[PDB]
Amino acid sequence: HKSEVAHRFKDLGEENFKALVLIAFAQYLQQCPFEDHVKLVNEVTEFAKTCVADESAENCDKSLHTLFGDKLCTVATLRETYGEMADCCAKQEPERNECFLQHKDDNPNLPRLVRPEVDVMCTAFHDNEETFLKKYLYEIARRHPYFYAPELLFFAKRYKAAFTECCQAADKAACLLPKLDELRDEGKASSAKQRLKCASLQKFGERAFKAWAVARLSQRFPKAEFAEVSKLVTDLTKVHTECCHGDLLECADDRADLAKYICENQDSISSKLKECCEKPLLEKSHCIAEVENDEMPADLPSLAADFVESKDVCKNYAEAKDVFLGMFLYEYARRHPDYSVVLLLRLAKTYETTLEKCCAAADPHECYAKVFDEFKPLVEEPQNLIKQNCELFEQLGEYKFQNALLVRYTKKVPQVSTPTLVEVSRNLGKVGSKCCKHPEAKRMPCAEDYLSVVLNQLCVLHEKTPVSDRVTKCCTESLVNRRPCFSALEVDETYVPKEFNAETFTFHADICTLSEKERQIKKQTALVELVKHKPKATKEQLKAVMDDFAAFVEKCCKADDKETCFAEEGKKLVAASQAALG
Ligand SMILES: CCCCCCCCCCCCCC(=O)O
Ligand SMILES: CCCCCCCCCCCCCC(=O)O
Ligand SMILES: CCCCCCCCCCCCCC(=O)O
Ligand SMILES: CCCCCCCCCCCCCC(=O)O
Ligand SMILES: CCCCCCCCCCCCCC(=O)O
Ligand SMILES: O=C(O)c1ccccc1O
Ligand SMILES: O=C(O)c1ccccc1O
Numbered sequence: 046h047k048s049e050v051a052h053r054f055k056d057l058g059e060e061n062f063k064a065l066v067l068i069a070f071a072q073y074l075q076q077c078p079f080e081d082h083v084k085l086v087n088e089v090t091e092f093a094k095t096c097v098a099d100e101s102a103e104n105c106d107k108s109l110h111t112l113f114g115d116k117l118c119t120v121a122t123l124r125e126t127y128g129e130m131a132d133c134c135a136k137q138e139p140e141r142n143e144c145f146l147q148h149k150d151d152n153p154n155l156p157r158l159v160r161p162e163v164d165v166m167c168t169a170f171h172d173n174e175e176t177f178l179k180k181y182l183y184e185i186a187r188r189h190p191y192f193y194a195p196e197l198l199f200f201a202k203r204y205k206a207a208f209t210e211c212c213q214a215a216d217k218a219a220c221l222l223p224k225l226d227e228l229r230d231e232g233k234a235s236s237a238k239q240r241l242k243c244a245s246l247q248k249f250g251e252r253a254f255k256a257w258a259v260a261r262l263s264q265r266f267p268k269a270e271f272a273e274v275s276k277l278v279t280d281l282t283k284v285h286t287e288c289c290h291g292d293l294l295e296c297a298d299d300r301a302d303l304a305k306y307i308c309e310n311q312d313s314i315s316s317k318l319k320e321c322c323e324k325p326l327l328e329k330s331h332c333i334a335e336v337e338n339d340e341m342p343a344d345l346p347s348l349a350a351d352f353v354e355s356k357d358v359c360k361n362y363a364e365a366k367d368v369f370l371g372m373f374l375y376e377y378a379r380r381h382p383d384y385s386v387v388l389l390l391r392l393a394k395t396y397e398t399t400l401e402k403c404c405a406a407a408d409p410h411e412c413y414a415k416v417f418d419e420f421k422p423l424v425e426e427p428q429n430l431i432k433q434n435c436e437l438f439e440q441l442g443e444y445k446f447q448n449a450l451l452v453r454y455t456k457k458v459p460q461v462s463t464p465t466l467v468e469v470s471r472n473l474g475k476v477g478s479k480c481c482k483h484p485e486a487k488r489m490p491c492a493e494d495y496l497s498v499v500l501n502q503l504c505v506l507h508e509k510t511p512v513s514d515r516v517t518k519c520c521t522e523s524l525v526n527r528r529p530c531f532s533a534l535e536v537d538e539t540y541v542p543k544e545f546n547a548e549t550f551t552f553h554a555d556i557c558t559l560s561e562k563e564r565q566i567k568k569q570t571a572l573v574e575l576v577k578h579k580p581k582a583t584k585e586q587l588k589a590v591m592d593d594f595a596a597f598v599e600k601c602c603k604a605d606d607k608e609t610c611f612a613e614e615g616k617k618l619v620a621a622s623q624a625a626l627g
Pocket of ligand 2: 062065069195294298301328329
C-alpha cells in the first residue's frame with residue numbers, strides 16, 4: 046500500500062510509534078546522547094504525520110527500510126563516533142541495512158545503570174513523567190540491541206504502573222523496590238531466553254529447533270491436529286531465524302502475520318486464545334506466546350497402539366523418518382503438559398535411536414517391542430529431583446536452602462570462583478521458591494524454564510574463562526543432556542583444599558549494619574571458602590560450625606562493645622572450628 050509510514054503510524058498510534066522509533070534508534074546509534082534521539086523521534090514523527098495527511102506526499106512513497114536508513118546516515122558524527130558503520134551509507138539499500146546489522150555491537154562498554162533513591166525517582170517521575178520514562182527506555186534499549194522492541198515497550202508500561210502506584214503510596218521504598226527488583230529480573234530472564242533460542246537455532250540447527258517447537262506447541266494446543274501444529278512450527282521457525290538475524294521490521298511483520306493466522310483459525314487451535322486475539326496489534330504476539338495450555342481431548346487413544354503395535358511402524362518411520370518422529374512428539378507432547386520440553390525430546394530421541402537399531406534386525410516387532418519401558422527412568426529422574434529438592438526447600442527456607450545448595454556445588458566443582466558459586470547457588474535457590482509453590486502438575490516445566498538460563502548464564506561465564514573440564518563437558522554437551530550432566534557431577538576428589546586464610550574468616554561489625562540481603566552474601570562467601578578449606582567436611586561437622594557462627598553474630602552484635610567479640614570471641618571460633626575439622 047501507498048506510504049508504509051502512514052500505515053504503520055495509523056494502526057500503531059502516535060504514542061507507541063514514538064516509543065518504538067526511540068528504541069530502534071537507541072539500538073543502532075547506541076553512543077549518541079538522549080537528546081539527539083529525541084530530535085530524531087520528533088523529526089520522524091512530524092514526517093510520519095505528513096504521510097498520514099497526504100499519502101502521496103514527499104517520500105511517503107518510500108519504504109520503511111529506506112527511510113530509516115537515509116535518516117540514520119544523516120547523523121553527522123557517524124564516521125567520527127561509529128567510524129566503520131558510516132561506510133554502510135554508501136551501499137545501496139538491501140546491502141545498506143544488512144551492513145547496519147553487522148555493526149550493531151551486541152555488547153557496548155556502557156556503564157552499569159544505577160538505581161537512584163526512591164525519592165529522587167518518584168520526584169523525577171512526577172516532575173516530568175514523559176522524559177523520565179523515555180529516557181530510561183533509551184538506557185535499556187542501547188544496552189540490549191537485540192531485545193525485540195515491542196517487548197521492551199511492554200516492560201515500560203509495567204515500569205510506569207509501578208510508580209503510579211508506589212510513588213502515591215505512603216511507604217514508597219517499601220512499595221517500589223520489591224516491584225522493581227521482580228521487574229528487573231523478569232526482564233533479565235526475558236533477555237537471556239532470547240539469546241538462548243537464537244544461539245541454539247545456530248548450534249543445533251533447524252531440525253532440533255523444530256523438534257523443540259513441535260513439542261512445545263502441541264503441549265499448548267493439544268486439541269489442534271498435527272497438520273496444523275506443523276504449519277505453525279514451520280512459520281514460527283521462519284520467524285525466529287529472522288528475528289535472530291536482527292532486522293526488527295521483517296521480524297515484527299513475520300510475528301504479526303503469525304498471530305493473524307492463529308486468531309483466524311482460532312477455533313481449530315485453542316480455546317484459550319480468546320483474550321489475546323481481542324488485544325491490539327502490539328500485544329497479540331506477546332500475549333499469544335504466553336497463553337496457558339488448552340485442555341486435552343480425554344478422548345485420546347494410547348501411544349502404544351500406533352507407535353508400538355501395528356507392523357506398520359518401520360514402514361511409516363521410513364516413508365519419512367522426521368514426520369513420523371515428529372508425530373510421536375506431538376502425540377506424546379499433548380498428553381503431557383507436565384513434562385519439561387527437553388524431557389519430551391529426551392524420549393523422542395530414545396525412541397528414534399531404538400527404531401534405528403531395530404528396523405534393521407531380525408524380527409522388528411520384537412525389537413521395538415518394549416520401548417516405553419526404557420522411558421520410565423527418563424521421566425523418573427527429573428521428577429525425583431523436583432520433589433527431593435522442593436521437599437528440602439519447604440523444610441529450610443529459601444536462604445537456608447541456598448546454603449545447602451552452595452555446600453553441594455562447591456564440593457562438586459571447587460575450582461569455580463567463589464563469587465560465581467554464590468551467584469549461581471542463589472538464582473538456583475530462587476527458582477526453588479518460584480516453582481515449588483506450583484502444584485506438581487506444573488513444576489517440571491517451571492524449573493526447565495528458569496534453570497535453562499541460569500545454566501546458559503553459567504556456561505558463558507565459564508566459557509569466558511574456563512576452570513574445569515567437566516563443567517565444559519556439560520556446557521558443550523547436547524542441549525538436552527545439559528541438565529543431567531550437571532546433575533551428574535560427583536564430588537571432586539582430585540581437588541586439594543585451599544590453605545587456611547586466617548583473613549578470610551575475620552569479621553568486624555559491618556555485618557550488624559548491612560542490608561539482610563547483603564548480610565548473607567557475606568556469610569555465603571565464607572561458607573564457600575570454609576568448604577574449600579576443608580571439603581572432606583561432613584554435613585554434621587559443617588552444620589556444627591554454622592551454628593557456632595550463626596550464634597556468634599548475634600549474642601555479640603547486640604553486645605555493648607559491638608566490636609570486642611568479633612576480633613575477640615572471633616579468635617575462639619576460628620581456633621575452635623579448625624580443631625573440629627582437623
Ligand atoms: C524496561 C523499560 C524501563 C524503563 C524505565 C523505567 C524505570 C527504571 C528505573 C531504574 C531501574 C533500572 C534497573 C534496576 O532496577 O537496577
Ligand atoms: C523507521 C520506522 C520504524 C517504525 C516502527 C515499526 C515497528 C512496527 C512493529 C509492529 C508490531 C507487531 C506486533 C508483534 O508482532 O508483537
Ligand atoms: C531449587 C531448584 C530446584 C530445581 C528442580 C530440580 C531439578 C529438576 C530438573 C530440572 C529439569 C527439567 C528439564 C529436564 O528434564 O532436564
Ligand atoms: C559454577 C558451578 C556451578 C556448579 C553447579 C551445577 C549447576 C547444577 C544445576 C542444575 C541441576 C540441579 C539438580 C542436580 O544438582 O542434579
Ligand atoms: C577454619 C574455620 C573457619 C570458621 C569460620 C567459618 C564461618 C563460616 C560462616 C557460616 C555462615 C552460615 C550462614 C548463616 O549463619 O546463616
Ligand atoms: O532492568 C530492566 O528493567 C530490564 C528490562 C528488559 C530487559 C533487560 C533488563 O535488564
Ligand atoms: O512468538 C510467537 O509469536 C508465538 C505465536 C504462537 C505460539 C507460540 C509463540 O511463541
